[PDB]
Amino acid sequence: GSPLPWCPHLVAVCPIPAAGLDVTQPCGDCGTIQENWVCLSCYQVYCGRYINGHMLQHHGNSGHPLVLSYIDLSAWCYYCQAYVHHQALLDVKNIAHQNKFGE
Ligand SMILES: O=C(O)CCc1nc2ccccc2c2nc(=O)c(Cc3ccccc3)nn12
Ligand SMILES: [Cl-]
Ligand SMILES: [Zn+2]
Ligand SMILES: [Zn+2]
Ligand SMILES: [Zn+2]
């Protein structure tokens, strides 16, 4: 489609845990190491919809809106049904990028 420069769910993006991110963390439900996302509200890690859809499940059972892909570090908002680019996402995207690419 077309990514958004903002969305009304950015307010749900929470502080990154001091433990940091582990981009190789497995899905908290199924333990897959593939195509995981991290929830930008509670930082639980769950798999994408092309694996077992545990992140989508987490959205449904928590309402948490925004998730970050450990594949390509894009942010998707489940409510807006769009990718979102915004300043509020840069820190988490960068901590993820550093952990991922060994920076
Ligand atoms: O997998 C998740 O749970 C999080 C990501 C996700 N969830 C959805 C849930 C319901 C309806 C639509 C989507 C959705 N549509 C998309 O285009 C994208 C981006 C994208 C991903 C992969 C290849 C190309 C584009 N992510 N996306
Ligand atoms: Cl912590
Ligand atoms: Zn899973
Ligand atoms: Zn969450
Ligand atoms: Zn949104």
Curated annotation (Swiss-Prot):
Post-translational modification: Phosphorylated by AURKA; phosphorylation increases HDAC6-mediated deacetylation of alpha-tubulin and subsequent disassembly of cilia.
Compartment(s): Cytoplasm; Cytoplasm, Cytoskeleton; Nucleus; Perikaryon
Record's note on what induces expression: (Microbial infection) Up-regulated by the presence of SARS-CoV-2 N protein during viral infection. The SARS-CoV-2 N protein enhances HDAC6 stability during infection by reducing its proteasomal degradation, leading to elevated HDAC6 levels.
Residues the record lists as binding Zn(2+) 2: 27, 30, 47, 54
Zinc finger (UBP-type): 5-103
Biological role stated in the UniProt entry: Deacetylates a wide range of non-histone substrates. Plays a central role in microtubule-dependent cell motility by mediating deacetylation of tubulin. Required for cilia disassembly via deacetylation of alpha-tubulin. Alpha-tubulin deacetylation results in destabilization of dynamic microtubules. Promotes deacetylation of CTTN, leading to actin polymerization, promotion of autophagosome-lysosome fusion and completion of autophagy. Deacetylates SQSTM1. Deacetylates peroxiredoxins PRDX1 and PRDX2, decreasing their reducing activity. (Microbial infection) Deacetylates the SARS-CoV-2 N protein which promotes association of the viral N protein with human G3BP1, leading to disruption of cellular stress granule formation and facilitating viral replication.
UniProt domain comment: Histone deacetylase domain 1 mediates the E3 ubiquitin-protein ligase activity. The primate-specific SE14 repeat region contains seven SE14 repeats with the consensus sequence X-L-X-Q-T-X-S-E-X-A-X-G-G-A and mediates binding to valine.
Protein name: Protein deacetylase HDAC6
